[PDB]
Amino acid sequence: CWPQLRLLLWKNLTFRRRQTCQLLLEVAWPLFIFLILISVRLSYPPYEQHECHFPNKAMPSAGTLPWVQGIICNANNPCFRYPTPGEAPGVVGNFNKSIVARLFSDARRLLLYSQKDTSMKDMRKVLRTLQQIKKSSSNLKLQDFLVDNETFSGFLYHNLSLPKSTVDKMLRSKSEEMIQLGDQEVSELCGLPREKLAAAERVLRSNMDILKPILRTLNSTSPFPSKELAEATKTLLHSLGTLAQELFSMRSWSDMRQEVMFLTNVNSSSSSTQIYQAVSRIVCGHPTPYCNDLMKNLESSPLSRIIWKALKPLLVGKILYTPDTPATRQVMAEVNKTFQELAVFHDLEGMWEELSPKIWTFMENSQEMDLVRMLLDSRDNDHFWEQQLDGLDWTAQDIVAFLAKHPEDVQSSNGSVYTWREAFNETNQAIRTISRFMECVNLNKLEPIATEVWLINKSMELLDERKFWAGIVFTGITPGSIELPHHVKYKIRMDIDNVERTNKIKDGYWDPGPRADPFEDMRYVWGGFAYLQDVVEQAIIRVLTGTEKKTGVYMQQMPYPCYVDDIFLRVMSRSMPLFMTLAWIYSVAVIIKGIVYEKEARLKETMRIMGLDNSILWFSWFISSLIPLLVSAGLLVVILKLGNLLPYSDPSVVFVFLSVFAVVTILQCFLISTLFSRANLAAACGGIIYFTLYLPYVLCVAWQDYVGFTLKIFASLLSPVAFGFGCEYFALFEEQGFNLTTSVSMMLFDTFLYGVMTWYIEAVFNLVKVYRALNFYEGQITSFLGHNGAGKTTTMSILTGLFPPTSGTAYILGKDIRSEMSTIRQNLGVCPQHNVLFDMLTVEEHIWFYARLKGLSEKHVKAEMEQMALDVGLPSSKLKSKTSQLSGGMQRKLSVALAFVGGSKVVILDEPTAGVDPYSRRGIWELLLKYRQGRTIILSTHHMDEADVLGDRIAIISHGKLCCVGSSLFLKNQLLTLVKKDVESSLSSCRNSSSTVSYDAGLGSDHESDTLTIDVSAISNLIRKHVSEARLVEDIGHELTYVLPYEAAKEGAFVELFHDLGISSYGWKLTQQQFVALLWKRLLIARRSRKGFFAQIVLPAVFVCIALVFSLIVPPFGKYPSLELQPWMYNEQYTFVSNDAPEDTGTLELLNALTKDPGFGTRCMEGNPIPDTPCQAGEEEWTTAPVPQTIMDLFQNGNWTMQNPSPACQCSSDKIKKMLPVCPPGAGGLPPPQRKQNTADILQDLTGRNISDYLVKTYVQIIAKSLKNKIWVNEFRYGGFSLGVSNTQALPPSQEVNDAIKQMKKHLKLAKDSSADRFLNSLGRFMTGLDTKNNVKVWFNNKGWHAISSFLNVINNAILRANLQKGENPSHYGITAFNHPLNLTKQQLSEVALMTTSVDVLVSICVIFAMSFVPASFVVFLIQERVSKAKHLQFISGVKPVIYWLSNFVWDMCNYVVPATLVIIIFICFQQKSYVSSTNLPVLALLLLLYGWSITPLMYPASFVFKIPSTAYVVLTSVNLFIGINGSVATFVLELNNINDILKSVFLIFPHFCLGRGLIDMVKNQAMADALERFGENRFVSPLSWDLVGRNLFAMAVEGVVFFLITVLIQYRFFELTKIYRCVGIPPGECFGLLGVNGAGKSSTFKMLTGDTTVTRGDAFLNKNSILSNIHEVHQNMGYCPQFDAITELLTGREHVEFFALLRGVPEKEVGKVGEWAIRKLGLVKYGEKYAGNYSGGNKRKLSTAMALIGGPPVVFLDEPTTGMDPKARRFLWNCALSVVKEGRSVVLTSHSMEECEALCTRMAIMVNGRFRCLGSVQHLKNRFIVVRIAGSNPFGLAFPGSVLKEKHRNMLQYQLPSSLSSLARIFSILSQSKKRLHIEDYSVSQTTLDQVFVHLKDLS
Ligand SMILES: *[C@@H]1O[C@H](CO)[C@@H](O[C@@H]2O[C@H](CO)[C@@H](O[C@@H]3O[C@H](CO[C@@H]4O[C@H](CO)[C@@H](O)[C@H](O)[C@@H]4O)[C@@H](O)[C@H](O[C@@H]4O[C@H](CO)[C@@H](O)[C@H](O)[C@@H]4O)[C@@H]3O)[C@H](O)[C@H]2NC(C)=O)[C@H](O)[C@H]1NC(C)=O
Ligand SMILES: *[C@@H]1O[C@H](CO)[C@@H](O[C@@H]2O[C@H](CO)[C@@H](O)[C@H](O)[C@H]2NC(C)=O)[C@H](O)[C@H]1NC(C)=O
Ligand SMILES: *[C@@H]1O[C@H](CO)[C@@H](O)[C@H](O)[C@H]1NC(C)=O
Ligand SMILES: *[C@@H]1O[C@H](CO)[C@@H](O)[C@H](O)[C@H]1NC(C)=O
Ligand SMILES: *[C@@H]1O[C@H](CO)[C@@H](O)[C@H](O)[C@H]1NC(C)=O
Ligand SMILES: *[C@@H]1O[C@H](CO)[C@@H](O)[C@H](O)[C@H]1NC(C)=O
Predict the structure, then answer these.
(1) In 3-state terms, what secondary structure has residue 562?
(2) How far away, in angstroms, is 1143 Cα from ligand 1 center?
(3) What is the H or E stretch that residue 330 is in?
(4) How far is the CA of 1404 from the centre of ligand 4 (A)?
(5) Is-contact 1745 1761, C-beta < 8 A?
(6) Of all protein residues, whose CA lies closest to atom 12 belonging to ligand 2?
(7) DSSP string, 949-963
(8) Residue 1281 and residue 1150: Cα distance in Å, rounded?
(9) Furthest-apart CA pair in the chain: how many Å?
(10) Which of 33, 43, 1267 is nearest to 644 (CA)?
(11) Residue nearest ligand 4's atom 4 by CA
């Protein structure tokens, strides 16, 4: 059973080997698509991130300095990769390292020491114990003051204008030379050297004078003198000891200048990172016209963008507010306090107005500071002051301390300057810059407002004025100073570009990621919603309760674990079966074209005739379908692993799984294959049912509702969803390497169910035969000619088909057919009517395929190929031309040749001669003639003359039983004349049978020879007009004893005969009436097509409905507003509470109220948030989880794991492989810690855990747990919060700081002015703006959009439930906080108008699909009118085709009116895009109806030449879609040259006609949307729907479409019968007929001649039926008929008749029922007119000749007048023609069967090369050159009564054109032709113009 399947695969594979284009599109299409998609991979490489950890933000209840470092420091959120110590349990601050923090730390140290210092006033009492007792030690360089008892030379000596010594007579040249050096050498050591170098040049006058000054000894020996000074100066030296230690030890402004001074002094000074590198070291660690110019430069400077977006809502902006009741004014007072804790900088200029000269002179002329300069340097102060100063710290020096202390001027310029004269203008510059910068921060930013609509309007104006922070709408009650109602809302309205967009509360489609893009998506805490949240919350609390601050609240993000993003891998492998489907859309289309292609030409059924069963067919297509698909799948595997697309899953099972899906897409291709009846309708419709085979997967990716066995329920029915789900299994087990067994199971069971649908859909759409019974004998040509019984085709088709018993007939066997159901079926071939061509295999391979397919192949059929080649007759031309379509004419010779190939036991052929006349009996009767000697060959037929040429026997079934049997001689002498005897013996008159053992006057002398011949030789004389068929009554032999009767006329007396023997020899208003007649016909085909195509009305309306119902769902984009609450507000989660630093200060008080009866959130003795619905179910006692046996693993984690790390590792992301998250090996952060389910959450009390590594690891394992299951999982928790205590390691608390400002203020000129009062009080509040007694810290997750605000509301809620004194519950306090953004501006409403416009461009492309899909209906009815029926037929009758195209076009408008109106009712019954208004209706509707007016002309010149039916539907839908999407890009100009192309689109669509409705439709809805919103809140412009902007271009062009209609009809305007031209005169009485083969163009010149161009193109031009000048007379009255059956494909029979009469007669009243005198005349009114439409079979040609009958022509034409008219309608329809031309109409004729035409004709017609000039009757043409077949293959009347007296057996004589006849019986026909023959030649003048003696019965001209 192999080689029939090997050759059968030779058929299937050879079908593709002989094409070489569908194989290359086939195997090259997935190459192209998968390489393009693999390019879309290799454009986007994988994106990797380390394990991101995040800094903590700060919030202004913490302190003003930590959060302004929170703004300047970390805008970027920089992913530190290692936990920044804010993410530790205890330590929070993150900014020890900030040197700005050490500055105000030093402010606290200097103030808190100056609270406890007595130094300068003890210096004052040193001075007063020097002012009173010592009484003079005011001592400068020049002179010495001393007023005492002169303990050590108490005197004076003046370095003055002259040398004066006030102890004796000084008396000086040397005077000014002495004191000029003396004030120069006025030093501690140069007092002695001045008198020394002087005393070298002076005398012992400088010995007593120097003797007093040595006893003076420069203010150090004098300090020894009194004892009361000594203790007081000891307190001086100790006081300057500790002040020296502190004032050096502060160290900060020293290092501040020693970082800022390098950058802006050096020569190049160019920018780098180094400016904000060094500034980033200043504020953090290692890891008005000048105002406006400055803010422009700060937006200009790079690496300062995001901090400018963040600082702009701090320093410029302005905030506002609602109802101002004085209690609520306390709220605004206290938020104003939290801003004016930054306001210590306005007064700072106020110091340098006031304190500056006091300092400048105190450091110049205070004698107290002179003593500080005195004791600052001495030898006793070297040991003492450098003992305490050397032990102070690593100080500058005592000499350097002396340097920066007290000058008189500069000492030297070049050496080293580090001094206060430098420093005083250093700090003076500093306060200038800080003054002018901090004169740009409007810290008066509050504006109370009574009505919130003024707040929104003023809000809009201020927003356009560049400065707007939030606006806090309250819900305060009345102007009544009951403080707050115990439960406040508030409503922080901000604009859209800062507060997060409040439409969606989660990420949407969850991709992984940390979501920390700092500009795009951190948007609460640079735009600064949250800052309003914290400040305003702490304000409300401080009103309601009374406690002062005692909380900071930081913001830490939860860290995110080292992910990757491969969104192309993810959405690609999630959406695999689209681009897997595409290559097999092409493959499915090719294989389904194969199946129904050979179903069309009936190769399956003739293959079943060849003795096969359907198993081998369907299996063969299964295999050879499978192989190119399978190699495409293997090529996907090679492009799939090696192309870097899917690692981690082993490359074998992708090939196995694609092999399975290849199998099941094949069986779904057979399932969609067995239902179609035409080649290319299937070959384009199959891929679209492969889309709709696919789409429930895309329709099932989101809804999700089919989780359980509903996957099996929608998988047993559907194959590609079962592939998509298994590929979801690939995508889930894709990055780390329900189930796939479900996928292969539903695939395999889906295939088996598809095969049950294949068979169960297949069944739903010597050689005797004894069954009454006969015996088809040895034969050598049998025949069965019975049409009175309609089961003769069922007799042969039952004799060899799939029925051993009969079908409603005698169920019995013949020659034991069931006993040899493969043997006798393997013996006797057949040849069906449907010509088995195997359309493009090869000629010798058609012979080889039918031969080997029969059997005896490898040896015998090789030899039989040559003998088969001895039957056709073109061996090398079969080799050169092998394609069966390439041959022609003798195709039926290859049919019967293919049947008679091999060993033909009983070749039961049927109808072998339906072809060309000179090859019909020549070809088929030549092959049946020469191949006759083998065995019996039955042959049914329709034309009977070939059966008369056939030569063993005949049969005539009466009603299922043979009314005769025996050869044609036996029916001849028992009853041409046999063809007439196929009716008179077709009834039940008489039956005869002789079933014997099958085991020209010279014809008158031959007639008398037959008279003298029948006696000696027993013979029955029979001359059939050309050949003396000498029958004989002989049982055996005598073929040589009878040759003497042939010897009497042995001149070519050939025995062309057969067998016991038988010998043979050779010897107007009617215009508009036709207009409404055509419209009537269209009304008929419309109204009668119920099952007919209402799909062209249902389809556009329903796809408008799927567009609009798709449009009801989409997000509106204009609802950035909402009114949210801010609880946790998410569905299921659980938070966590870390009670860190458990030393029960106030944190115990906090957690004590965060987990008690008011609970975690916002309700208050009522369920206030609306879906929260309290539902307190959950115990009050801590209950952990059960643990598997790894707590010994935890005990041996107590070995070697402490809090430094405390899990194992994680399966970290790698360099060449990657992982989406990253897994733990064991249990990361391992024990499940304590639980407490309270209100829809179970807050897991971490306590002292390592919180960051817990969050990373346990987030990993809960995601990777619930991702294998793939519930497409959201997030597990959204925000926790540690509690805490930050240490009190700072100086003793805030009240002592304030008291230090108290007595610091009381000392040193206590003042109440504008400057020093406000500066000192503001410094007091600023310094109390840094203490954080505790601090909670919020750990939010950021993946929820609204977490950051929300837990902040939860915590500030908790502080409110904490601090209250002893109320009767903390239950009904509490605070919510509604985010609610602000109405949009011009630009934002405009931009969302643009987006909503694009979302409606979707509706443009779908309604342009539907009204793109209407006109193809009108096209395909025009193809059904152009295909050989009534374009030509109705164009024959004089119509002037302007009215024809205007008829069809006016209808197509009128039929366009209905479904477009239905679409108008669709989205006017909907409420989108068109409404009640007068700018919605007209520009829609007139555009639609006028849009049908637009398209419907332009489809007609696309429908002249489209030479294939019922596919312009498809391809015009395609090209019209490409016009639409060309529209979509043609105004996607938003993603003056742009106005040159996009405003050139109006001139581009000025001649373009189908884009205009789309894009002008989008101008319509853009205009109504834009004016809707914009006059919806603002001023008015003109509503311009019907204006010249959008719509008038559409009305201009598409109302210009009538020019395209003129292009259509103008495109069509370019497109008896006496033929005696440049002589065949067809007169008005004859019956002509075209029977010639020497010419070919007479038929094209006939349909041309019956048509417009009456003469032949490229030939003689003359007057033969001229139809040009007097048109609609000659060629238009003359009825014709095409070669096919012009049948009005589904119109009606009766209305086809009466309509065809109505369009031409102008007899409309009598043309109402002229079809009774025509349809009743044609004999087709019962079974042809009531059963209206496709009246089957032979009645169609009767209706065609009927449609040419009613014309009433002057000359008729009927070519191919019969093709299935075997029973009666050949000579009966020919009898109707005989009535036509016999009534005086002079018909024409053309036939592929010269017998039945030649019997009825009267004159032949044939053209050699010029005109026809063929004028001959049948007996004359036979007399010169049956006889009609032999001649067609090789190259007054009263004397009938005289013969009726001569021939005494006077029979009848049917008339003729010129001729007569004689039907006398052959009883004694001796003298019947003897005396009439010798008299026929004797009295041939009686037959003068007849001029013939032409030849039981006879006929004679
Ligand atoms: C909770 O659990 C987490 C688990 O991650 C702990 O996080 C650990 O925190 C440590 C903080 O000190 C991290 O150590 C850092 O490691 C960096 C990486 O350099 C390593 O170098 C060694 C040898 O040189 C190699 O073996 C490693 O493979 C790395 O190459 C160090 O650079 C870093 O040192 C710091 O650098 C900065 C910047 O230069 C300096 O400013 C600073 O002074 C210091 O020198 C530091 O040592 C550790 O990676 C991290 N993870 C793990 C798995 O240990 C938390 O600490 C736990 N919580 C508590 C409260 O302990
Ligand atoms: C901002 O938009 C809102 C809603 O679109 C407007 O709120 C309206 O308030 C008035 C007060 O009675 C009523 O018309 C409606 O309750 C609200 N909606 C509408 C559509 O009017 C608010 O007035 C707008 N403000 C501005 C300045 O446009
Ligand atoms: C600041 O530095 C001191 C070093 O004396 C250290 O003890 C303290 O813990 C640090 N504080 C913070 C919040 O980092
Ligand atoms: C300000 O200090 C600078 C330091 O370079 C000095 O040159 C200048 O003279 C000082 N100006 C006054 C007015 O003291
Ligand atoms: C608000 O604070 C500013 C300081 O920033 C101050 O000048 C102003 O007087 C305050 N106004 C009220 C009403 O407290
Ligand atoms: C709102 O603002 C418009 C101008 O923007 C102004 O004409 C109108 O009077 C304002 N209405 C109110 C209630 O403030």
Answers:
(1) coil
(2) 28
(3) helix 326-340
(4) 76
(5) yes
(6) 453
(7) HS-S-EEEESSSSEE
(8) 12
(9) 212
(10) 43
(11) 422
Q: Confirm or reject: Cβ of 453 under 6 Å from ligand 6.
A: yes
**Using CB atoms within 10 A of its CB, is residue 201 exposed (0-12), middle (13-18) or buried (19+)?**
exposed
Query: What 3-state DSSP class applies to 315?
Result: helix
The full set of domains in the chain, from first to last, is 2-43+565-762 (no CATH), 767-984 (3.40.50.300), 1388-1611 (no CATH), 1680-1751 (no CATH)
122-149 b/e (C-beta count within 10 Å ≥ 16 → b):
bbebbbebbeeebeebebeeebbebeee
Query: Could you tell which of 359, 425, 431 is best to mutate to test the pocket of ligand 4, judged by most ligand atoms within 8 Å of the CB?
Result: 425
Q: Which residue has the tokens 């069944």?
A: 763
Distance (Å, rounded) from C-alpha 111 to C-alpha 1327? 10
Distance of alpha carbon 1873 from alpha carbon 1001, whole angstroms: 10
**Is the beta carbon of 1252 within 6 A of some atom in ligand 1?**
yes
Residue nearest atom 4 in ligand 3 by C-alpha distance:
96
User: In this structure, what token pair is assigned to residue 1055?
Assistant: 């025995």
- Which atom in ligand 4 lies closest to the alpha carbon of residue 426? 2
Q: What one-character DSSP code corresponds to residue 920?
A: I
- The radius of gyration of the chain from alpha carbons, rounded to an integer in Å, stands at 59
Q: Which ligand is nearest to the CA of 438?
A: 5
In this structure, which ligand is nearest to the CA of 84?
1
Count, residues in the chain: 1901
Instruction: For ligand 1, say whether the CB of 82 is within 6 Å of any of its atoms.
Output: yes
Q: Do strands 767-769 and 774-776 pair parallel, antiparallel, or not at all (unpaired)?
A: antiparallel
CA 77 to chain centre: 36
Q: Which residue lies with its CA nearest to atom 9 of ligand 3?
A: 91
Whether the CA torsion 1547, 1552, 1556, 1558 is positive or negative: it is negative
> Ligand 5 pocket: which of 321, 337, 340 to mutate (most atoms <8 Å of CB)?
340
Q: Cα(81) to centroid of ligand 1, in Å? A: 9
Q: Enter the tokens of residue 32.
A: 């192209």
Question: Measured between alpha carbons, how far is 1884 from 420 in angstroms, rounded to an integer?
Answer: 163
Distance 440 CA to ligand 5 centre (A): 16
Residue keyed to tokens 């692993």: 641
Q: How far apart are CA 1606 and CA 1604, in angstroms?
A: 5
| CA 1323/CA 746 separation, integer angstroms | 79
Task: List 1282's β-bridge partners, or say none.
Answer: 1138, 1337
Query: What is the DSSP pairing of strand 830-831 with strand 908-910?
Result: parallel
With contact defined as beta carbons under 8 Å apart, do 1315 and 353 qualify?
Answer: yes
Q: Distance between CA atoms of 587 and 668, rounded to whole angstroms?
A: 12
| Ligand with an atom nearest the CA of residue 1248 | 1
Tokens at 1885, concatenated: 């003048």
Q: Tell me, letter by letter, the H, E, C secondary structure of 1278-1331.
A: CEEEECCCCCCCCCCCHHHHHHHHHHHHHCCCCCCCCCHHHHHHHHHHHHCCCC
DSSP per-residue string spanning 838-852:
-TTS-HHHHHHHHHH
Which ligand gives the minimal distance to the CA of 456? 2
Atom of ligand 2 nearest to the CA of 460: 27
Burial-class residue 1726 by CB neighbours within 10 Å (0-12, 13-18, 19+). Answer: exposed
Q: Which amino acid is at 1564?
A: K
1332 CA to centre of ligand 3 in angstroms: 15
Method used to determine the 3D structure: cryo-EM
> d(Cα 63, Cα 1330) in Å, to the nearest integer?
5
Q: Is the CB of 1212 under 6 A from ligand 1?
A: no
Binding-site entries for ATP: 786-793, 1636-1643
Q: Which residue has the tokens 């605000």?
A: 1349
> Tokens 């062309």 — which residue?
1056
- Protein residue closest via CA to atom 13 of ligand 5: 333
The answer to whether the CB of 1577 is under 6 A from ligand 2 is yes
Asked if 1681 and 1751 touch (Cβ cutoff 8 Å), the reply is no
Angle at which helix 567-574 crosses helix 720-732, to 10 degrees, equals 150
Distance CA 584, CA 33 (A): 12
